[PDB]
Amino acid sequence: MHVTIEQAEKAIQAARAKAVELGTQMCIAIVDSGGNLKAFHRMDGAWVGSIDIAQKKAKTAVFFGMKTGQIGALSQPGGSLYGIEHSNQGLITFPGGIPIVDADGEMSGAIGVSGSSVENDDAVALAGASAIGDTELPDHPW
Amino acid sequence: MHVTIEQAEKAIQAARAKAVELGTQMCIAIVDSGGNLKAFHRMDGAWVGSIDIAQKKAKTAVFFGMKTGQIGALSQPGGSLYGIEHSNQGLITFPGGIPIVDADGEMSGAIGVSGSSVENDDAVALAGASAIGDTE
Amino acid sequence: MHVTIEQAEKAIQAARAKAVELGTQMCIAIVDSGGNLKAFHRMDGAWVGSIDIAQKKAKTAVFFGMKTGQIGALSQPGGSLYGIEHSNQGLITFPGGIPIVDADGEMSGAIGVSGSSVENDDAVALAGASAIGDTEL
């Protein structure tokens, strides 16, 4: 399965609602299981630099089937994936990207959020992904 | 996009004057609120590598509404923004970029300065931005 | 003294068989001694992100004649090669790239593997490289 545009827009609206509740102005990106952009929403007032980061976060999450901050926990100096961010035209490995997982457990795309603290980004991404699916893959080696 | 070419040039001159006072040779860049280049001045003798750095600093500051070194305080190993410099075709997160903030409290652009120690870079940037507005 | 396509495909099928034995889904790249792509195989279900990583690992290994993780051991903060990953359109310096060394001890190419833990990546790369030659200069 691929994330449909209807699903992507529902997730964007759920994410935007959580952003407004937290008092934030976010960029919200949805990509499909190929990393290709499916939908994008820059809230009024959101940081311009967050446009690229939201899309890179979604890409990173779908490229590896993992929330972005979980990759960053492995890519610190000394870590097993130090330097992974150079790959794939640039990854983002701090929180804000979350895989979207369909009913039969397959990853159909991902959401990426940027524009506030990384903790607020994660909470907004989670609200957006949870409105359309499960958000986690089991048995991940990382 | 609100910073005028008149204001950009005034900031460059206030920055150049602070640079001469500190004994430095600087590149100075002004970008608008979208990160697009508005004005640029390379003092004679400035390091060639500072041309790109000053522009990236100005871009970085306006992309996030923060002085560049304040982003670097969060992007160290173990920091919440570790790796952010890979975004946006390359950020610079040590001092030298400062938001330009108009009287309405809206950010209209940013200045970026490179060519000396990062302390002098930030002093020169601040002199320029403060000539045409607030900086936070 | 360049890996042939028959050797590249032998190395890919050996790496793939090791991958399955370990329960993994890998991307496996073979490059030549110039770093140019020779063969590629993305196993069904492999991480999309591992496509680029497997190729960069093979390139990195052949660009310096050593296993990728040995470079990473030197490119930590404070290490002699800190920042090397910015060169060559991007290196990968965690395990999974191994050089392919001919009979007379000359490097003819490299293998790169991505898609699981880095230790599983190295194990699968070694199975692939060892099937067609030596693995060290």
Place this chain on the structure above:
Amino acid sequence: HVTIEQAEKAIQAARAKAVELGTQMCIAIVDSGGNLKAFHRMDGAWVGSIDIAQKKAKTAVFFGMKTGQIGALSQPGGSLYGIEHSNQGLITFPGGIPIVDADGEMSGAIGVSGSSVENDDAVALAGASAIGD
């Protein structure tokens, strides 16, 4: 600006030092704008050192410093952390040195890659010392 006569003399001095040390190096010369003036890849040198030698030469001339002097400042917690993202990629470990003319004006830089960074720096110094300070 460094002349091609000077660039080639620096490459030959660097090459001779590299052979003395048993190394196979890539040697690059750039002008004061960072544009390539000469390049020499010794037989058997690491293919990856082609790009690194050139980025080292560019880095040294872009800031008027030896490359490793910049890396000393760009560690975590250092004042230049992240600088390598600039200028399409810098190299900040040893092997790049400025070429400075009789007066203290920088005319170019040399960049060397292909061995340990210490050997890289010794070979670079031999080349740059052959034609100036």
